[PDB]
Design a protein around this ligand. Structure first.
Ligand SMILES: [Ca+2]
Ligand SMILES: [Zn+2]
Length: 110
């Protein structure tokens, strides 16, 4: 019966998140902070992809070793950490590979 105008974007260097937030001012932005060497990150990534098809939000992937300043800025200390950003400000986070909690968080702030 419908498809969502979805967006799933992987960032490349510090500055890209701030640019993305400015480019998408009135969307909820959901950021997956992950690491290349993180098993739980790889396991959840296809579920995060599936979620991006269900909600009119901007879904973002950030490798903590490629965007070190951004990880530091968001106080990332475990991976995956999912951050919901609304109107440029952090409104929630989920620490760990729980797709149910991520979806609950999106439901709350979208
Ligand atoms: Ca799908
Ligand atoms: Zn876009």
């Amino acid at each position: 019966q419908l498809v969502i105008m979805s967006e799933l974007i992987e960032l490349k260097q510090d500055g890209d998140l701030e640019s993305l937030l400015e480019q998408h001012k009135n969307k909820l932005v959901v950021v997956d902070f992950f690491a290349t060497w993180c098993g739980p990150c790889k396991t959840i990534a296809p579920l995060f992809k599936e979620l991006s098809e269900k909600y009119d939000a901007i879904f973002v992937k950030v490798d903590v070793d490629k965007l070190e300043e951004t990880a530091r800025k968001y106080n990332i200390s475990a991976m995956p950490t999912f951050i919901a950003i609304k109107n440029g400000e952090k409104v929630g986070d989920v620490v760990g590979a729980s797709i149910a909690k991520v979806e609950d968080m999106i439901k709350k702030f979208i």
